[PDB]
Amino acid sequence: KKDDLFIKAIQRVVLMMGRFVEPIDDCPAGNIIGLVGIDQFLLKTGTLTTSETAHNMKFSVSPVVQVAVEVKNANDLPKLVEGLKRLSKSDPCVLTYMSESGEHIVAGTGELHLEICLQDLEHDHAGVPLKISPPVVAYRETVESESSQTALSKSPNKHNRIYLKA
Amino acid sequence: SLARAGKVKSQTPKVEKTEKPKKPKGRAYKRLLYTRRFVNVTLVNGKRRMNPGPS
Amino acid sequence: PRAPRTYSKTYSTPKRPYESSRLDAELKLAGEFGLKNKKEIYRISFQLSKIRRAARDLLTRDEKDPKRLFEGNALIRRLVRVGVLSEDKKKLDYVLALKVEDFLERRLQTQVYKLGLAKSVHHARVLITQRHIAVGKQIVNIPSFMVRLDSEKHIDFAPTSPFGGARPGRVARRNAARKAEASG
Amino acid sequence: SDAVTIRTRKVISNPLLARKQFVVDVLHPNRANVSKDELREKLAEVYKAEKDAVSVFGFRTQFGGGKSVGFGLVYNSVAEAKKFEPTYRLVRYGLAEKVEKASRQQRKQKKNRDKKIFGTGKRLAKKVARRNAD
Amino acid sequence: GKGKPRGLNSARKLRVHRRNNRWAENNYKKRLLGTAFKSSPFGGSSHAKGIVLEKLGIESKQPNSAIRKCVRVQLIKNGKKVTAFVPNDGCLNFVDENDEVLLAGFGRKGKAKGDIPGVRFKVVKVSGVSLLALWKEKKEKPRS
RNA sequence: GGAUAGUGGCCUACCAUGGUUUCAACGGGUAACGGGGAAUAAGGGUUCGAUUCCGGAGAGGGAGCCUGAGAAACGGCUACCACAUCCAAGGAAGGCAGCAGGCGCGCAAAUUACCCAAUCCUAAUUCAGGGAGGUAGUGACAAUAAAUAACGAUACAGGGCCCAUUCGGGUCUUGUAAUUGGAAUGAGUACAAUGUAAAUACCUUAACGAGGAACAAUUGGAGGGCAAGUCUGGUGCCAGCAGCC
Numbered sequence: 001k002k003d004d005l006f007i008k009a010i011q012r013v014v015l016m017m018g019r020f021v022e023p024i025d026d027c028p029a030g031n032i033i034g035l036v037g038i039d040q041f042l043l044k045t046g047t048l049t050t051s052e053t054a055h056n057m058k059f060s061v062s063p064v065v066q067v068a069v070e071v072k073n074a075n076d077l078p079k080l081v082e083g084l085k086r087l088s089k090s091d092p093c094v095l096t097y098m099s100e101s102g103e104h105i106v107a108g109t110g111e112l113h114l115e116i117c118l119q120d121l122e123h124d125h126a127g128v129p130l131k132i133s134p135p136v137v138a139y140r141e142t143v144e145s146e147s148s149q150t151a152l153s154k155s156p157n158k159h160n161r162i163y164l165k166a
Numbered sequence: 167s168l169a170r171a172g173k174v175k176s177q178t179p180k181v182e183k184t185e186k187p188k189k190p191k192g193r194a195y196k197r198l199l200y201t202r203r204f205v206n207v208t209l210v211n212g213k214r215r216m217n218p219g220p221s
Numbered sequence: 222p223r224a225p226r227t228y229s230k231t232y233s234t235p236k237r238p239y240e241s242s243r244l245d246a247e248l249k250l251a252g253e254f255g256l257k258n259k260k261e262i263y264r265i266s267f268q269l270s271k272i273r274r275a276a277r278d279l280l281t282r283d284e285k286d287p288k289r290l291f292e293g294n295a296l297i298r299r300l301v302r303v304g305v306l307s308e309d310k311k312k313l314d315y316v317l318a319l320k321v322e323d324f325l326e327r328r329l330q331t332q333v334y335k336l337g338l339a340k341s342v343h344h345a346r347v348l349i350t351q352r353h354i355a356v357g358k359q360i361v362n363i364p365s366f367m368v369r370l371d372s373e374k375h376i377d378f379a380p381t382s383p384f385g386g387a388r389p390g391r392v393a394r395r396n397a398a399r400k401a402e403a404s405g
Numbered sequence: 406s407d408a409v410t411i412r413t414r415k416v417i418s419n420p421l422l423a424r425k426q427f428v429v430d431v432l433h434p435n436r437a438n439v440s441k442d443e444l445r446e447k448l449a450e451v452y453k454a455e456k457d458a459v460s461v462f463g464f465r466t467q468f469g470g471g472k473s474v475g476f477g478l479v480y481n482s483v484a485e486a487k488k489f490e491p492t493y494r495l496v497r498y499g500l501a502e503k504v505e506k507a508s509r510q511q512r513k514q515k516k517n518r519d520k521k522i523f524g525t526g527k528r529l530a531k532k533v534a535r536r537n538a539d
Numbered sequence: 540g541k542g543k544p545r546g547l548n549s550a551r552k553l554r555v556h557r558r559n560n561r562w563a564e565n566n567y568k569k570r571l572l573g574t575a576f577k578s579s580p581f582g583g584s585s586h587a588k589g590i591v592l593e594k595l596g597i598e599s600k601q602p603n604s605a606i607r608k609c610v611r612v613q614l615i616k617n618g619k620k621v622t623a624f625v626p627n628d629g630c631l632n633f634v635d636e637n638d639e640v641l642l643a644g645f646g647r648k649g650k651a652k653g654d655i656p657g658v659r660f661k662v663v664k665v666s667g668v669s670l671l672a673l674w675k676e677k678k679e680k681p682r683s
Numbered sequence: 684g685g686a687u688a689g690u691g692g693c694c695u696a697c698c699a700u701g702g703u704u705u706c707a708a709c710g711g712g713u714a715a716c717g718g719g720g721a722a723u724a725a726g727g728g729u730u731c732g733a734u735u736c737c738g739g740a741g742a743g744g745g746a747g748c749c750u751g752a753g754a755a756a757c758g759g760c761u762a763c764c765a766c767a768u769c770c771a772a773g774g775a776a777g778g779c780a781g782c783a784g785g786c787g788c789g790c791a792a793a794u795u796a797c798c799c800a801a802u803c804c805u806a807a808u809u810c811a812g813g814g815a816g817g818u819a820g821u822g823a824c825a826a827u828a829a830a831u832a833a834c835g836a837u838a839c840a841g842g843g844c845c846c847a848u849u850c851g852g853g854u855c856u857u858g859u860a861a862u863u864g865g866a867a868u869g870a871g872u873a874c875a876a877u878g879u880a881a882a883u884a885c886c887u888u889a890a891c892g893a894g895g896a897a898c899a900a901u902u903g904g905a906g907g908g909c910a911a912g913u914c915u916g917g918u919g920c921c922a923g924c925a926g927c928c
Contacts, residue, residue, distance in 0.1 A: 011784090011795055020769090025511075037784090037795070075615060077590055077637060081683070098683045102637075167921090168596060168608050172629025174918045181916085188899055192831065193257040197343060200252025201858065204245075207841095208858095217905085219914045222816075225735055228826040241910050257829085277725090340834080347833045351868035352469070360469035363828075380434065380471070381888095383866080387435065393866065437888035438876045464877060470887035473877080493800060493880060503880085509798070516812095551706075576714060583714070586790040604920050616789070628923070641790075646926050653925065664790095 004046075011037020042089055063095050063107035067114060068133040069121065070103055076128055080104075083126030087117070090125075101136045232263040233270070250321070254331060255342035261365065265324050272296070276316045303327060304370035329356055329366035336376065355379040407435040411447055413477070422489055423481040425452075429461075432472050439473070445498070448479060457498060458483045460490060579649070580614060580621050581642070581660075588641045589614050591634060595622065599654040607655040610634055612642060612662070624658045627674050639666045 014021045016034040027033050038048075047056050071080050084104045088094055095107045106117055114132075121130055147165035190198065202208075209215050235243075251259060275296065279289055293313050300306030305323050306315065325331075330345050333354060339345035348354045349364045356372050360379045366372075378385030383393075409431060416427035433439060444464075446456040464475035480486045487500075495501035506512075522529070543553050561567050569575060575583050589612035597609050608631050612623045623642060625631050634640055641664040645652035651659060663670055668680045 009794090009796080023514075075590065075613075078639060102683055104683060168594060168606075168631060170922055171608060171625070171631035172627075173922045175628045175922080177922090178917055185896095187895060188831090188897095190832070191900065193251075193255050193343060193346060194832065196248070196251040196256065197833095199248050204249060204252075206858065216910095217912055217914090219912055223735060226826090230826065239909050244910070261828095344833060347867070350830075350832095353867070355469075359467060359472070362468075365828085382868095390866070391868075396865085433887095438886095440876050444877095466877065466886050468886055473887090475877095491800090496880085508796095555707090571713080573712095573714070584790060588790080602920085605923070606921095607923090643790090 004043075006041075008038045008040065010035075045092055059093060061109040063093075063109050063113075065108055065111060065114060066099075066105045066135045068101055068103045068105050068136060069130055070133060071126075071128050071130045073128055079126065079128060083121065083124070083128075086125040087120060099136055100138065103133075105136060231267055232260055233267050234263060235266075250325075253342070254325060254328070255346055256330075257346075262321070262325075265321055268324055269319055269321065272300075272319070273317055276313070280313065302369050303367055327368055328364065329354075329361075329368060330364045332356075332368055332373070332376070336373070338378075353379055353382045355382075355385070407433070409433055409436075409439070409447075411451070423485050424489075425479050427477055427479075428474065429477040430472065430474050434471050437470070438466065441497075448477065452479050454479050454481065455483050457500060458486050460486070460494065460498075462494070575649075580617055580619050582617060586641055586643050586663075587614060587616075588639060589621065589623075591623075591636060591638050591640055593636075594631070597622075597655060597657055600656060603654045605654075607658070609655070609658055610662075612640060614642075621660065622658050624652070624655065624661045626661050626663065626670060630670050630674065633670065633673060633680055634662060634665055640664065 013024050013027050014034045014036065015024045015027075021034060024033070049056055069080075069084075073079075081104075084096060088096060093109070094113075096104055099105045106114070108114060108117070120126070121128070143166055151162065151164050151166075153160065153162040189195070203216070209218065247259065247262070250256075250262065256262065275292070279292055279296075282289055296316060297306065297311045297313070300316065300319075301308060301311075304327055305319065330342060330349065333339040333345045333348060334342055338354075339348055346364065350362065352360050352362055355361065355377060356366055356368070357375065360381070380387050382388070383390050389397075411429065411431055413427045413429050416425060418425045431439065441461065444461060445459050448454075448459045449456045452459075458480040460478045460480065462476060462478075464473045466473050480489070487495075492501055496503040543556070546552075575581070581587055591610050591612050593611050595609040595611060596606050599605050599607065608625050610623045610625060610631075612621050613619075614621060621642070623640070624645075625634060640662045642660045643663045645659065645661055647659070649659065651657075652661075665673075665680055668678055672678045673680055
């Protein structure tokens with residue numbers, strides 16, 4: 001069954017030389033190479049086969065710091081969404097997601113991630129000014145006694161009486 | 167109160183579809199129309215009614 | 222660079238499509254002669270529209286005009302060739318009196334019924350779309366064949382079909398195989 | 406194979422290049438179609454030219470089967486066919502061999518590579534080779 | 540007689556008189572003056588995308604006592620405040636905030652649709668997901 | 684008199700004060716390249732026409748120039764303007780409104796595929812080259828045709844008419860069936876053949892391919908215009924419906 005499979009054809013294979021990419025006709029059954037034309041949509045690193053079945057092939061310090069990002073410019077929602085999507089594309093270990101805030105909280109294994117995505121969201125795919133926010137929190141409530149005093153309810157219809165304990 | 171968006175939509179009861187073999191379509195649909203409207207004389211009483219309620 | 226390919230619609234919806242005076246009579250026609258859709262019948266109305274318009278501006282002028290006599294003589298030859306026009310009326314007046322049926326009973330969907338080989342207009346469709354009738358020497362698949370008054374002398378069953386020989390049948394052979402396997 | 410009854414139509418001869426052009430109609434009841442291999446030499450015994458000197462192309466099948474119409478062409482002699490018939494059809498018949506070649510881009514990439522280099526490059530080759538050596 | 544001249548060589552007189560008369564059409568006038576281009580917030584466009592900023596609770600006219608749950612949407616190319624109306628029930632929460640909705644007309648060609656004033660356009664798509672298909676539970680709207 | 688290949692205020696020195704204009708000059712806007720045409724309709728007419736054909740303008744905005752018969756050429760250069768690549772910090776290399784493909788933009792628009800086999804063009808020329816072009820891929824922009832189903836036998840209900848032997852048969856019918864039966868090809872499979880530069884497409888045809896639980900056809904409405912409920916359950920000026928009332 002097709003889970004995340006696509007049948008796009010190879011555009012061109014290349015061999016990079018210090019960002020001076022030169023064209024390559026074909027490549028052997030080994031050695032690392034550069035490839036373009038079939039990335040397009042991507043979520044995480046994977047592999048590629050040709051046969052029907054074609055059976056084929058964790059890091060230290062998990063992301064810890066969560067920081068919300070809000071763009072200063074008003075008309076930036078499509079721009080912000082595109083920027084975060086291609087940031088996730090370019091970051092193989094990031095785990096950003098909307099969370100409760102819904103502002104696509106930025107994750108990272110240490111504050112060096114915050115430092116690098118500073119200049120990233122400043123002069124990269126986003127290319128827009130923005131400010132940071134304190135990390136989101138999630139605090140619940142509970143009870144620890146047995147309702148020493150009874151409860152009551154009031155309404156315009158005063159005949160409704162409720163007596164409950166917690 | 168804007169929170170009442172589709173208020174009655176939520177209060178409506180849950181009714182599911184009933185099993186029914188598919189009605190033939192194409193020239194059979196035109197055939198099905200003829201065999202029950204013109205040649206059929208079941209409903210020709212006063213106005214040639216074709217969706218009457220329970221009377 | 223390419224030469225554009227000419228195309229033209231062969232149907233036209235009426236100005237009033239929402240009224241009960243015409244749908245009932247139209248429902249009768251589709252059921253009587255067994256037509257799946259009704260885009261075909263507005264096409265027939267389009268067929269009558271062009272000849273009526275061609276006839277309308279033909280009689281606007283006087284007689285003995287060389288183009289008028291050619292167009293009149295050429296036209297009446299077509300209708301008598303297909304058969305929608307009788308063989309004893311060539312006064313350029315009956316070419317305006319055609320009604321919707323006259324261009325519709327000439328359809329191959331009804332010719333086989335008139336020959337008694339279908340027993341119903343809908344069963345005739347069961348002989349047409351499944352290539353079980355050969356209006357000419359070669360098998361056809363078009364219900365709207367527009368016979369030209371000479372197919373009746375040439376009509377015959379399809380060669381590669383039952384009642385025409387050369388084969389017993391497809392599912393008939395399959396049923397025989399099942400019977401032979403069950404018997405053994 | 407049931408009553409093939411091969412038959413030609415509109416046969417005209419032109420000694421300009423020694424060929425006979427005609428359109429052939431074949432009716433084959435109880436048969437799906439006729440392949441090219443046996444379709445070629447059935448004209449050999451009716452025209453006495455040669456089995457492989459004949460040439461046939463097209464043969465569009467009419468709707469419903471049992472009849473094929475297309476263009477057929479017979480040749481005076483084999484030796485004429487080599488330098489008259491285009492080589493793109495001898496590969497279909499097997500008389501000639503299709504020249505092995507890559508796609509059209511490889512020739513374009515090669516052509517501009519020689520275009521950007523002036524001369525044979527034989528003198529430039531070792532001078533660059535020595536320059537990279539030291 | 541009968542007003543307009545009927546002279547053989549008078550053609551230019553009633554030709555220009557025709558031009559001034561057809562100047563009074565609602566169709567002729569705004570077609571050339573570009574009111575749909577310089578004043579309308581669509582720029583001659585059948586549909587346009589926008590960003591919802593906040594919601595509105597505008598009431599209706601007599602004799603209806605109801606609110607249509609209108610929303611405020613800002614365009615991109617033009618950039619002026621524009622009101623929008625939620626078409627169907629329960630879609631207000633799907634157009635709550637920060638949704639890349641698309642605007643569409645009402646069929647009135649530049650006036651109020653019904654009993655809800657201050658509104659002239661409606662929304663049919665949200666972030667590439669149509670509202671009617673979601674109302675039929677055919678597709679899903681991405682949260683972000 | 685100069686320059687042009689040519690006539691000409693094209694330009695030059697002199698002379699005259701003139702030329703057009705309410706018969707719409709001149710200036711402004713054009714979501715203005717023009718035409719051949721397209722949509723719409725008895726007629727008249729209105730709108731559109733960048734878009735396959737013809738004639739014009741452009742290669743980011745101008746200006747200048749050689750070669751060349753033919754250029755103010757930009758897939759030829761020179762300088763500026765605003766972008767913009769490589770720097771081993773001296774310098775050098777460029778203008779996709781050419782074929783694909785990318786970004787920003789937008790309601791809005793496809794593949795960085797194969798071939799000169801076709802219709803031609805170019806050169807020294809039959810042979811070579813051409814993202815001119817053709818083929819294929821996406822594609823519900825628009826056009827044509829056309830699947831999703833029919834036919835027998837039993838149980839009811841009928842119309843002429845035969846006996847007038849009682850309300851008995853009903854011999855020919857047309858429909859409803861918690862009735863059953865055979866024949867029938869198509870979509871999808873494709874052995875094979877034709878097709879095509881090789882294929883992928885069409886038709887033919889070994890063979891596999893319905894009994895509905897199946898091989899499942901939807902978009903809207905049912906107060907009026909606008910034909911389609913005084914049917915059932917839920918909400919009760921609230922949700923809402925509604926292009927109009």
